[PDB]
């Protein structure tokens, strides 16, 4: 009875929030689309264009960590993620749909009761997990590489 | 359930001297910080260099980049400040410069892959056998960290 991918992410992240659910989905989609790691020394590098909870799902499931210099953050307030296996020619790019981010913002108000705020947290997670893939993000496989600094 | 070392190595993806540094800093911080004072108190960590070591801190001290709880101020220094939010204290750990110097002597640009991996194992064990006094200096100081 191993921990599930979800349980591993939440254990590491330390709470359940809509933004970690977004990262769980991006991580799993990247796992699916990137294909088979081509060599033992090939590393998954990721460039994220915003720093948020989501990064932690990427660290746990894609194994691209801050400590390895494999997770690269360029803060531009964009929910866009570029994934690359080293030695390959390709970037797997995922951009979360703007409508998704818009809706999640509505669930955070400064003047909520703690009960109300927590209800909206759980609603946001339902929302993220029930989106169809095409509604959730846009995927482009493009020529490109990432490298460590 | 995995051991703390298993958890760190599995997350980090290899066993290197720098992860061993981080592991020891993380367990010393877990010891010296004391009991988390409230369910809403968070461990924030400010690190003065980005290296493998940070992964141990993320896993064991729970201070992750996704949570904005791990804060990197890149100054090429193996110094770490730990803070439970709501408290008055910073727990500061500085890895001994002699330790870093010795680890640097184990890296050479044109090693064989075999020689290099031998030196990796030597360096890991070197970190793990250090006495605490030899490994780092600890200061508990008045101060706070907050998320940016
Ligand atoms: Zn979160
Ligand atoms: Zn390492």
Author numbering:
A (entry chain A): 3 to 151
B (entry chain B): 4 to 151
What sentences appear in the manuscript?
Here, the first crystal structures from PF02663 are described, representing two bacterial and one archaeal species: B8FYU2_DESHY from the anaerobic dehalogenating bacterium Desulfito­bacterium hafniense DCB-2, Q2LQ23_SYNAS from the syntrophic bacterium Syntrophus aciditrophicus SB and Q9HJ63_THEAC from the thermoacidophilic archaeon Thermoplasma acidophilum. Two of these proteins, Q9HJ63_THEAC and Q2LQ23_SYNAS, contain two domains: an N-terminal thioredoxin-like α+β core domain (NTD) consisting of a five-stranded, mixed β-sheet flanked by several α-helices and a C-terminal zinc-finger domain (CTD). The proximity of fmdE to genes encoding the catalytic subunits suggests a role in methanogenesis for proteins in PF02663. Individual proteins within this family display differences in domain architectures, metal-ion binding propensities and dimer interactions.
B8FYU2_DESHY, on the other hand, is composed solely of the NTD. The final model includes two protein molecules (residues 3–151 for chain A; residues 4–151 for chain B), 18 ethylene glycol molecules, one Zn atom, one Ni atom and 427 water molecules in the asymmetric unit. The total β-­sheet and α-helical contents are 24% and 58%, respectively. The monomer consists of a central five-stranded, mixed β-sheet (21345 topology) with one solvent-exposed face, while the other is covered by three α-­helices. A distinctive feature of the structure is the protrusion of two helices (α4 and α5) and a connecting loop (residues 99–138) from the core of each molecule. X-ray anomalous scattering measurements indicated that the site had a mixed occupancy of zinc and nickel. The total occupancy of the zinc and nickel cations was reduced to 0.75 to match the observed scattering at this site, with a zinc:nickel ion stoichiometric ratio of 2.6:1 estimated from the ratio of their anomalous difference map peak heights. Pairwise structural comparisons of B8FYU2_DESHY, Q9HJ63_THEAC and Q2LQ23_SYNAS revealed that the NTDs of B8FYU2_DESHY and Q9HJ63_THEAC are the most similar. The second motif contains Asp58, Gln61 and Thr67 (B8FYU2_DESHY num­bering) and is located along the twofold-symmetry axis at the dimer interface. The absence of a zinc-finger domain in some PF02663 homologs, such as B8FYU2_DESHY, provides some evidence for involvement in alternate processes.
